[PDB]
mmCIF file of C-alpha atoms and ligand atoms in Angstrom:
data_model
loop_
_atom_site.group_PDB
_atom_site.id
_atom_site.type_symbol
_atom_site.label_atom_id
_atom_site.label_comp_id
_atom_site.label_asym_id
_atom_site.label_seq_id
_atom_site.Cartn_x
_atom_site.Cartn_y
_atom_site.Cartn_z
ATOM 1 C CA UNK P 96 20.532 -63.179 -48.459
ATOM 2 C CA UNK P 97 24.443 -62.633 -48.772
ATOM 3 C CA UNK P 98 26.292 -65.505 -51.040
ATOM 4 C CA UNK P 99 23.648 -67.491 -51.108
ATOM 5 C CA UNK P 100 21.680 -69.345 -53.935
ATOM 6 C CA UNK P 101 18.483 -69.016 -55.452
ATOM 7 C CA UNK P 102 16.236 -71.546 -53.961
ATOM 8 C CA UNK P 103 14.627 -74.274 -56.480
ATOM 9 C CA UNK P 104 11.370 -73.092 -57.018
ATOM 10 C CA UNK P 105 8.876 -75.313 -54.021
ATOM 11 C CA UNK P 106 12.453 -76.345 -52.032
ATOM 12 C CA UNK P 107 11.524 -73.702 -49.615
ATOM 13 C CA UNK P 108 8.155 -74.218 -49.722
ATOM 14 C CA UNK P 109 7.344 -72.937 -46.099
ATOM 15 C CA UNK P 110 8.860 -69.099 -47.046
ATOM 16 C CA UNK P 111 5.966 -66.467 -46.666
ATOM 17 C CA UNK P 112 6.540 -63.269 -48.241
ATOM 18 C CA UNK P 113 4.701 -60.147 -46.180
ATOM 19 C CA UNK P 114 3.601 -57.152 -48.377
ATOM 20 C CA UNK P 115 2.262 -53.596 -47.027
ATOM 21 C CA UNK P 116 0.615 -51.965 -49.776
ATOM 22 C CA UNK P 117 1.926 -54.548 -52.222
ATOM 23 C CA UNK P 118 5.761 -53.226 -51.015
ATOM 24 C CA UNK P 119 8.214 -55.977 -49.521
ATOM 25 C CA UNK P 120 8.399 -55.850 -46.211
ATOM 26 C CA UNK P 121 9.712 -59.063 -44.239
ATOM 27 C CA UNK P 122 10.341 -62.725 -44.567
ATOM 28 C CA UNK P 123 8.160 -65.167 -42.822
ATOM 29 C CA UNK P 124 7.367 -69.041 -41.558
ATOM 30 C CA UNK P 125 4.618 -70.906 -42.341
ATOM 31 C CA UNK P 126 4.186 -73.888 -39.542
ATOM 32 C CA UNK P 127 0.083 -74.626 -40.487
ATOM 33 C CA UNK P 128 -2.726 -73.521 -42.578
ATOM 34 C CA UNK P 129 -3.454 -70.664 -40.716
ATOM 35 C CA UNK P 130 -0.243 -69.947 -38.552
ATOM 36 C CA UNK P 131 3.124 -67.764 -39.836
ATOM 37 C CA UNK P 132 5.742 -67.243 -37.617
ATOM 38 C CA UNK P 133 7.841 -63.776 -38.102
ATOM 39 C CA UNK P 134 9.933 -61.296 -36.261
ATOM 40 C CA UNK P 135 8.446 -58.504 -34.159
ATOM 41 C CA UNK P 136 10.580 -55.660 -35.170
ATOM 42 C CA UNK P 137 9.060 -56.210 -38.738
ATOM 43 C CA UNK P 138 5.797 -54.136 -37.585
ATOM 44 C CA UNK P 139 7.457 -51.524 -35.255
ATOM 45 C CA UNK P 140 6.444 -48.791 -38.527
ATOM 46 C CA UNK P 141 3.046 -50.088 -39.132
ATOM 47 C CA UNK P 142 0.627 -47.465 -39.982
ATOM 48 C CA UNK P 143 -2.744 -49.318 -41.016
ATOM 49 C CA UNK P 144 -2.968 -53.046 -39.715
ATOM 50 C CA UNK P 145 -5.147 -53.796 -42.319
ATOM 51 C CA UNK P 146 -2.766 -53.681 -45.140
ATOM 52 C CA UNK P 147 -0.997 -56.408 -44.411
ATOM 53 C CA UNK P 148 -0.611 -59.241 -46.891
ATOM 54 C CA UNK P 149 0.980 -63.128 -46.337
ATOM 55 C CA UNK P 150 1.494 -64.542 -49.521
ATOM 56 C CA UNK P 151 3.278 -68.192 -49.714
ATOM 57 C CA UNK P 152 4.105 -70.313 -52.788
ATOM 58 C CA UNK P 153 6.280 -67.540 -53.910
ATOM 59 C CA UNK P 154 9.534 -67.776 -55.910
ATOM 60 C CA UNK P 155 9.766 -65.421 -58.274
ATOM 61 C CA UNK P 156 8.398 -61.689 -58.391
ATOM 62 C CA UNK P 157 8.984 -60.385 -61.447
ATOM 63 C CA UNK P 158 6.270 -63.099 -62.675
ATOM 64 C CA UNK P 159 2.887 -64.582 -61.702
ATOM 65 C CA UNK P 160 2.935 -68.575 -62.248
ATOM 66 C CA UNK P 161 -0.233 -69.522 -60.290
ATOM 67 C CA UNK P 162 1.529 -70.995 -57.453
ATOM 68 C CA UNK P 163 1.586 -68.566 -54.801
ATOM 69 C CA UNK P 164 -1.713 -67.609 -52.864
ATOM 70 C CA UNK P 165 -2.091 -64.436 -50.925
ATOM 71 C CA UNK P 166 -3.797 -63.446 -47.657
ATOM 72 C CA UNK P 167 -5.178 -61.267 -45.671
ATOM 73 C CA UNK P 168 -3.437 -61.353 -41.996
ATOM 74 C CA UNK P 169 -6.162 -61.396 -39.443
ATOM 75 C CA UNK P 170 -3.741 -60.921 -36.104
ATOM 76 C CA UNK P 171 -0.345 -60.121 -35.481
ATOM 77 C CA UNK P 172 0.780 -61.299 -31.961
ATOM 78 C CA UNK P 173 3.722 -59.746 -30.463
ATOM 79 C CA UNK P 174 5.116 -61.115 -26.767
ATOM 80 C CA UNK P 175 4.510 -58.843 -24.034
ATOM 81 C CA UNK P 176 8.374 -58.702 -23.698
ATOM 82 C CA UNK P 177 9.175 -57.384 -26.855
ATOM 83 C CA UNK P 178 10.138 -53.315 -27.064
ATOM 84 C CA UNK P 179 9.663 -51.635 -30.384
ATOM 85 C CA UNK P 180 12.805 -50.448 -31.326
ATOM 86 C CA UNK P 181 14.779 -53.117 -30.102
ATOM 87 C CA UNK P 182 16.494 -56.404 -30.404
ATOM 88 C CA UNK P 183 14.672 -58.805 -27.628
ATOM 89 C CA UNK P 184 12.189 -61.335 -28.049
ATOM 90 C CA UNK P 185 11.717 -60.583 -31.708
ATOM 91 C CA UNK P 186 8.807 -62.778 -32.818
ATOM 92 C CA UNK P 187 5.496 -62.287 -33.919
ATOM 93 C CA UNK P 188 2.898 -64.704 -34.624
ATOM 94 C CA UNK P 189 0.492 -64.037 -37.726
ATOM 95 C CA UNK P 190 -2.974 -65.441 -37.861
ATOM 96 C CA UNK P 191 -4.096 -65.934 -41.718
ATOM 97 C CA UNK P 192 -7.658 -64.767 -42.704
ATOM 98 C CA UNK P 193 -8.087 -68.010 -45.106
ATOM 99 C CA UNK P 194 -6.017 -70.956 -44.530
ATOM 100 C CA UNK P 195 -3.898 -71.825 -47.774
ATOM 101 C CA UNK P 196 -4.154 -74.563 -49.404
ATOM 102 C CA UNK P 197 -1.468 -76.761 -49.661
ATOM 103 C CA UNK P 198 -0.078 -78.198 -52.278
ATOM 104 C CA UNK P 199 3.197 -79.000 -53.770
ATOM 105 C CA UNK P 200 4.219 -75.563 -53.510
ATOM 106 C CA UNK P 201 3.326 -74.347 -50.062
ATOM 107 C CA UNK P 202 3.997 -76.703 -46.824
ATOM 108 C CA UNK P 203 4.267 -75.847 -43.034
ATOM 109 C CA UNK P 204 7.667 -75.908 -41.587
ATOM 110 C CA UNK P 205 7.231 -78.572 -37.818
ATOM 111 C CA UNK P 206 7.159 -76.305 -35.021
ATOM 112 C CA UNK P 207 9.106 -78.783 -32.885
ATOM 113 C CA UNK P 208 8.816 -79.508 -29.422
ATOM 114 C CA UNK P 209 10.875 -77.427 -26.623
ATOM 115 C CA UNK P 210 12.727 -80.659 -25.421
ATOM 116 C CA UNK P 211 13.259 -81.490 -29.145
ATOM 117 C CA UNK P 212 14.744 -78.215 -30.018
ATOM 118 C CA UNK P 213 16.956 -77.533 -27.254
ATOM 119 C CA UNK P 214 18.332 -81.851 -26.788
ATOM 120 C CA UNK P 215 18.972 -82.306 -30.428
ATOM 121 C CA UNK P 216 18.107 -79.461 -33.275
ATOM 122 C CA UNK P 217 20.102 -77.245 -31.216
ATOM 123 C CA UNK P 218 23.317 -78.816 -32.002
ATOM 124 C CA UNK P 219 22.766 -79.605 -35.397
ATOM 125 C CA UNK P 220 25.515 -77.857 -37.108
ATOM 126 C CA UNK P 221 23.939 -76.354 -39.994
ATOM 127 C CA UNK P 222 20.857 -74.633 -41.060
ATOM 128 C CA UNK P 223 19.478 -73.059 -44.063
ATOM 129 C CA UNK P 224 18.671 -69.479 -44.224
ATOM 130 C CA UNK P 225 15.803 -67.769 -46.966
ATOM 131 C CA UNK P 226 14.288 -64.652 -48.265
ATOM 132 C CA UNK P 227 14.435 -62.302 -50.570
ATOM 133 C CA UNK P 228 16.452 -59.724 -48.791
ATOM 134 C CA UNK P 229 19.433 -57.741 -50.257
ATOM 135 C CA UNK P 230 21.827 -59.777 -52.107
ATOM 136 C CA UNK P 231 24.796 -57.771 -50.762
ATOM 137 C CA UNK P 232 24.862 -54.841 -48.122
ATOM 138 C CA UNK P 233 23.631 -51.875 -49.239
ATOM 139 C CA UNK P 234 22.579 -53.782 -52.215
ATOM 140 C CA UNK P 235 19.883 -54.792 -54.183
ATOM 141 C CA UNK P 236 16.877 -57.470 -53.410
ATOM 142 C CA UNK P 237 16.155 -60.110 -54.682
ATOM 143 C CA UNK P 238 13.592 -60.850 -56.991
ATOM 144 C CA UNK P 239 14.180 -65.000 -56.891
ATOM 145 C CA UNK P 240 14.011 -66.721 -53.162
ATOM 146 C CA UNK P 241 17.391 -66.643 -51.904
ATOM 147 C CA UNK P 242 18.578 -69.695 -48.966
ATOM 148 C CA UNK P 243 22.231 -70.418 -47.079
ATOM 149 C CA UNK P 244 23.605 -72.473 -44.913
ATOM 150 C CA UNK P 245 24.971 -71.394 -42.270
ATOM 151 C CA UNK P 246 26.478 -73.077 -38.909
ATOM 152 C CA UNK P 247 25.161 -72.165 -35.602
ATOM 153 C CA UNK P 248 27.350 -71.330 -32.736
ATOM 154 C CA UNK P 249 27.270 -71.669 -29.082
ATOM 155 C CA UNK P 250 27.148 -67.597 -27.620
ATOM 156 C CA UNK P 251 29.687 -67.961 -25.765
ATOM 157 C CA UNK P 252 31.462 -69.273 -28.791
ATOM 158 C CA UNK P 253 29.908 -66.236 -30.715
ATOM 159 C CA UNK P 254 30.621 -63.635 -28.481
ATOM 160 C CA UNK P 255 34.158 -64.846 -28.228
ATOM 161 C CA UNK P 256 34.553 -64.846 -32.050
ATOM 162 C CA UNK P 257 32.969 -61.511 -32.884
ATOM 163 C CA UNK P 258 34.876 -58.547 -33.308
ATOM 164 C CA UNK P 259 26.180 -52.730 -29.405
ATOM 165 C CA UNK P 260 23.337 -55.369 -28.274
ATOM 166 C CA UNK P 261 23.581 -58.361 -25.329
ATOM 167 C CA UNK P 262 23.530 -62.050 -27.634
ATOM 168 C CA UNK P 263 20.153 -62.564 -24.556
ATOM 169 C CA UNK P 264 19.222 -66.289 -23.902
ATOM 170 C CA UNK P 265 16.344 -65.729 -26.373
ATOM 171 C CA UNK P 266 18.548 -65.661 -29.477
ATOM 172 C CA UNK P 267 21.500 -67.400 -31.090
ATOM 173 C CA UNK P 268 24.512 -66.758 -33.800
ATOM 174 C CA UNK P 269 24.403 -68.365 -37.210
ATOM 175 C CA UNK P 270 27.012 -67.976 -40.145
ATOM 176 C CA UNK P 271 30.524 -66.460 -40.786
ATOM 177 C CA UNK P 272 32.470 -63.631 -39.804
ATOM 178 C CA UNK P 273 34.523 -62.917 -43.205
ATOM 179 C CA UNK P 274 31.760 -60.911 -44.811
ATOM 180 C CA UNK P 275 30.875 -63.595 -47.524
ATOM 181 C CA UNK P 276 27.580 -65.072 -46.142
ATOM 182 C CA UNK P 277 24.851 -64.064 -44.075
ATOM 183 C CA UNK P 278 21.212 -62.698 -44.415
ATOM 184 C CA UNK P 279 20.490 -59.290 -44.663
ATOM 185 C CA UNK P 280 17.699 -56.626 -44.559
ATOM 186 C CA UNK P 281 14.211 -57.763 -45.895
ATOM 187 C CA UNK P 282 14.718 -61.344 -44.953
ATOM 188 C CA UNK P 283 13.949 -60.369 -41.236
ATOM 189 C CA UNK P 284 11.451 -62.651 -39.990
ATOM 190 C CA UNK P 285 12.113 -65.721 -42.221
ATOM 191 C CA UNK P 286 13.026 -69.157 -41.328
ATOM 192 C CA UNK P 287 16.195 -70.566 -40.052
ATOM 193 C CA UNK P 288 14.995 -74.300 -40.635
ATOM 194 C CA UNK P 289 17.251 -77.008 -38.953
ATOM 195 C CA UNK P 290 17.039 -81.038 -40.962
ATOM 196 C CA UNK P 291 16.879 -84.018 -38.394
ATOM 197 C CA UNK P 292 16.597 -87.424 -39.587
ATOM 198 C CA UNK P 293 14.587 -86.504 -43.314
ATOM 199 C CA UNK P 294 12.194 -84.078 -41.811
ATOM 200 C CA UNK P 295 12.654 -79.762 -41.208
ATOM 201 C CA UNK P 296 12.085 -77.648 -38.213
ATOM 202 C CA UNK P 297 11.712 -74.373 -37.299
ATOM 203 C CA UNK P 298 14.758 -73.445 -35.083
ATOM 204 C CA UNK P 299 15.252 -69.818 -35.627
ATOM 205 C CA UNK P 300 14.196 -66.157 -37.306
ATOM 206 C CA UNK P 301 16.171 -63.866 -39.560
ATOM 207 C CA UNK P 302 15.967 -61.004 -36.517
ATOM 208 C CA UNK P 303 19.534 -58.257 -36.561
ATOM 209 C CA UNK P 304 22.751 -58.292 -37.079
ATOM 210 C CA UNK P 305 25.735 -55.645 -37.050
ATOM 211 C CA UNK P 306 24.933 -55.029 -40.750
ATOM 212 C CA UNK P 307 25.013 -57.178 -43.096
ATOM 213 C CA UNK P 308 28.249 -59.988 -43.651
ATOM 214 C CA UNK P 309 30.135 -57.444 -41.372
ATOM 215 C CA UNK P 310 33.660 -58.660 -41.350
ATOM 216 C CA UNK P 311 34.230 -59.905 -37.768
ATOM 217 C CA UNK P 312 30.308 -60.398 -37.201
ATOM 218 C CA UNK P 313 27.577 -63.154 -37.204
ATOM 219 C CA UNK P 314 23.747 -63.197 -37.822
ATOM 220 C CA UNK P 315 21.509 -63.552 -34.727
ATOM 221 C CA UNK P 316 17.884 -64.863 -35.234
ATOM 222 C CA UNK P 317 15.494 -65.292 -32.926
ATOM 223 C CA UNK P 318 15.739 -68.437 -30.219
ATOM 224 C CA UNK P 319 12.312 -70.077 -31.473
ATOM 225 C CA UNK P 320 12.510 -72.937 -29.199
ATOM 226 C CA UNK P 321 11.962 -70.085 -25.851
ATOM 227 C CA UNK P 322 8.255 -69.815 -27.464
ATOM 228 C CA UNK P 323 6.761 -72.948 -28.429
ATOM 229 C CA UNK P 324 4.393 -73.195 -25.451
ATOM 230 C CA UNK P 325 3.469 -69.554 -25.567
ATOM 231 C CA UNK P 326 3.278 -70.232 -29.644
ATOM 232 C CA UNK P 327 0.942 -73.489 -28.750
ATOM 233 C CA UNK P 328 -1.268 -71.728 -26.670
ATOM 234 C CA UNK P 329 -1.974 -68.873 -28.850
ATOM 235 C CA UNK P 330 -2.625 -71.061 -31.762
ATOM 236 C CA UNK P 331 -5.247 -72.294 -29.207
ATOM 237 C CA UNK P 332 -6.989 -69.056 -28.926
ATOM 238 C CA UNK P 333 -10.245 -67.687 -30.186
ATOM 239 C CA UNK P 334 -9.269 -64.637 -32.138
ATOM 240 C CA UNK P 335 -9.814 -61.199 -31.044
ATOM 241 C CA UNK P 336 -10.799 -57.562 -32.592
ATOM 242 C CA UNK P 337 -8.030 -55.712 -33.774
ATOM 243 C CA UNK P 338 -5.046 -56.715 -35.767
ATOM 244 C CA UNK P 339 -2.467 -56.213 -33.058
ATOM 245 C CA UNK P 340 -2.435 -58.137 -30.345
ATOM 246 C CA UNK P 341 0.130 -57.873 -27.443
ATOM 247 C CA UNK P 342 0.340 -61.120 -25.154
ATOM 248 C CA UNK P 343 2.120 -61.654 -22.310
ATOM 249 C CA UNK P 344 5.054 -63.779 -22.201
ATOM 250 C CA UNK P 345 5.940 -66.119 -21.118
ATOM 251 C CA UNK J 272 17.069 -95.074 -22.551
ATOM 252 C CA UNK J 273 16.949 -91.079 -22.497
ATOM 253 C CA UNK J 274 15.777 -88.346 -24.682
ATOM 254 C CA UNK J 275 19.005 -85.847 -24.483
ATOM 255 C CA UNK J 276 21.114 -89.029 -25.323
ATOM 256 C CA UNK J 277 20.871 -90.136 -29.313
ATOM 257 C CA UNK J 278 17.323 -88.457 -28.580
ATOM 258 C CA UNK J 279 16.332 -91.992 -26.860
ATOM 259 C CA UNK J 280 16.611 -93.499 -30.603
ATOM 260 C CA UNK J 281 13.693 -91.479 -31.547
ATOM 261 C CA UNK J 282 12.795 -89.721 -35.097
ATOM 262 C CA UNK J 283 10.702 -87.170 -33.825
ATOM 263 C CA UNK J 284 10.219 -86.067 -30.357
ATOM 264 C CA UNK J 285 10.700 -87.865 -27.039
ATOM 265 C CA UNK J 286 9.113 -88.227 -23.838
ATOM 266 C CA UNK J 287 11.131 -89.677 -20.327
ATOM 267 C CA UNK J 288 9.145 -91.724 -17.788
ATOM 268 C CA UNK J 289 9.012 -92.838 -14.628
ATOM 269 C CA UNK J 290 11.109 -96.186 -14.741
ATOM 270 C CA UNK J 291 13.673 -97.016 -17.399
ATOM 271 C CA UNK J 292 10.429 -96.243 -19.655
ATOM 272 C CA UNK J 293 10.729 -94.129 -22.955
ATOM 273 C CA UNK J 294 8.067 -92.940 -25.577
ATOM 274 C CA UNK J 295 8.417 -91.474 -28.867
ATOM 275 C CA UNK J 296 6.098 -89.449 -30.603
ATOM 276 C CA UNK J 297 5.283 -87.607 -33.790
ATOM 277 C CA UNK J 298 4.175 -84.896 -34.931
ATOM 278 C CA UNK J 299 0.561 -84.233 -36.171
ATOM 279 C CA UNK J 300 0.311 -85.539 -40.168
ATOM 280 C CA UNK J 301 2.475 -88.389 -38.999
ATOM 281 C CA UNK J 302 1.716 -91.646 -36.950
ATOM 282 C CA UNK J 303 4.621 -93.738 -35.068
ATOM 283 C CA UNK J 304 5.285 -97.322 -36.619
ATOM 284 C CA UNK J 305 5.677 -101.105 -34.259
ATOM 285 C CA UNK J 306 9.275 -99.779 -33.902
ATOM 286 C CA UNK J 307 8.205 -97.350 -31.430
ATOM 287 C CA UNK J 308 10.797 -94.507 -32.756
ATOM 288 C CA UNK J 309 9.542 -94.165 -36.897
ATOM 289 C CA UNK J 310 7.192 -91.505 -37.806
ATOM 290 C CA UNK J 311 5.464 -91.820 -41.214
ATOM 291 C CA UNK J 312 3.087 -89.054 -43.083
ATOM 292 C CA UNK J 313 -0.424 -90.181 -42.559
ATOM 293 C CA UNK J 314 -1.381 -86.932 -45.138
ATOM 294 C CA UNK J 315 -0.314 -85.827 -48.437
ATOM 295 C CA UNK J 316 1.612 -82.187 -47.079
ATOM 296 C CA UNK J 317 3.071 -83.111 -43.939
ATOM 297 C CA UNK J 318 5.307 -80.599 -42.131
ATOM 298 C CA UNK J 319 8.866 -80.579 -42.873
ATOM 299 C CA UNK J 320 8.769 -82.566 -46.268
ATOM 300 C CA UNK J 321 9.955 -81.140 -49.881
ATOM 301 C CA UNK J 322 6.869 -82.763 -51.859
ATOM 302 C CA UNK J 323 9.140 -82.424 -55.099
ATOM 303 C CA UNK J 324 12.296 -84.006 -53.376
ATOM 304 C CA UNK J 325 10.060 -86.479 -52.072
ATOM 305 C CA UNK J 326 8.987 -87.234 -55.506
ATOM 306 C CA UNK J 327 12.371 -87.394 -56.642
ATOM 307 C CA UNK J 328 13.408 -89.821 -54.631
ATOM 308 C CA UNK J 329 9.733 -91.993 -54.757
HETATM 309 N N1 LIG Z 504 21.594 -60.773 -40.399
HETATM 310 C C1 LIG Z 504 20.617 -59.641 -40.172
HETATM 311 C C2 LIG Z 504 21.230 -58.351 -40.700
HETATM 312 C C3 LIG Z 504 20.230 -57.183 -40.572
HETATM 313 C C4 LIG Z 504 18.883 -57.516 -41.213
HETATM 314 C C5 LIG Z 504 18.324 -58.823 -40.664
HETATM 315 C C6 LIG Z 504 19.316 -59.961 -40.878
HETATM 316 CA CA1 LIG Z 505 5.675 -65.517 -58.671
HETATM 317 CL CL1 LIG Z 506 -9.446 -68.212 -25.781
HETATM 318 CL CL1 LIG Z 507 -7.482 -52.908 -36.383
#
């Protein structure tokens, strides 16, 4: 996250943190006990499935406070849609081994509903941002949770303003275009959480950009309110062999 | 009333029905109040609530 502040330790407690042998590799949301939402292009490189830790209650990881629980992630589901590689449909959905527990300290972002998201939470101004991505292109990460707030935009609005990949129906602009504020690499797949009337929502996820804070550029995450039925059904599921699995969409 | 208007006075999420009929809803870990349009936690971690803000403001 670019000029941003840390996050009070349990004020984001729905972040996930996802490790591959114990290495930062992605943001993500947690929206139950079981279920994390994160971005597809997060897994394009993955060598052994099996690796793959979620850890939530997370703040800061230089230390070990006893807050954060870690788990083993059981099945990554990737939309039939998605290309590895590229910028499209760039969601994932993560199945947990163990549920976590929740406490003070770890909480599920609402998955809204479709007519929710798109009537109301999509014109909600502003929305906060988190990870611990770089703090400043081609910078350093973070090692305390980062968040921002940054306005969404209409993409016609966005594409207007910015000054090379399609802004599809299945994603949407947050933030600035003078370079000061915007998240960056290794908070792909976190939340972009949207407040209505005392109570958070998952609107969007941390998916590319033109670099980070480019001058002239915005963020685009991932349009989260395209997937809630496929999400819903899914979460239905019995799950299956094999970490990956690829499922059609929609 | 409507859902994409005011979202039909709801908290939550909204439902349109045949007639000039309307019904709110909540989510799961919440349960909708006489009002018809309130949702209030009916667990201790519902979704979408800062248990320390919460707290702070308890
Ligand atoms: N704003 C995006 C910049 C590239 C990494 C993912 C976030
Ligand atoms: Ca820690
Ligand atoms: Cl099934
Ligand atoms: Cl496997």
């Amino acid at each position: 996250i670019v000029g941003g502040k840390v996050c009070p330790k349990g004020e984001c407690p729905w972040q996930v943190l996802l490790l591959v042998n114990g290495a930062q590799l992605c943001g993500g949301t947690l929206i139950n006990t079981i279920w994390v939402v994160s971005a597809a292009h997060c897994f394009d490189k993955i060598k052994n499935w099996r690796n793959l830790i979620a850890v939530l209650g997370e703040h800061d990881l230089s230390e070990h406070d006893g807050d954060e629980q870690s788990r083993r992630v059981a099945q990554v589901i990737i939309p039939s849609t998605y290309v590895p590689g590229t910028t499209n449909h760039d969601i994932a959905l993560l199945r947990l081994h163990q549920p976590v527990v929740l406490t003070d300290h770890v909480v599920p972002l609402c998955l809204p509903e479709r007519t929710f998201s798109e009537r109301t939470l999509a014109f909600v101004r502003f929305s906060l941002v988190s990870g611990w991505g770089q703090l400043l292109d081609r910078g350093a990460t973070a090692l305390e949770l980062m968040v921002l707030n940054v306005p969404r935009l209409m993409t016609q609005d966005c594409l207007q303003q910015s000054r090379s990949p399609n802004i599809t129906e299945y994603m949407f602009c947050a933030g600035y275009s003078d370079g000061s504020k915007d998240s960056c690499k290794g908070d792909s797949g976190g939340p972009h959480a949207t407040h209505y009337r005392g109570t958070w929502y998952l609107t969007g996820i941390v998916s590319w950009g033109q670099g980070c804070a480019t001058v002239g550029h915005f963020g685009v995450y991932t349009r989260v309110s395209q997937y809630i039925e496929w999400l819903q059904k899914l979460m239905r599921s019995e799950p299956r062999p094999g970490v990956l699995l690829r499922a059609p969409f929609p | 009333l409507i859902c994409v208007n005011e979202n039909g006075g709801c908290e939550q999420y909204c439902s349109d029905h045949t007639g000039t009929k309307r019904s709110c809803r909540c989510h799961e870990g919440y349960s909708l109040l006489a009002d018809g349009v309130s949702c209030t936690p009916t667990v201790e971690y519902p979704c979408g609530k800062i248990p320390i803000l919460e707290k702070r403001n308890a």
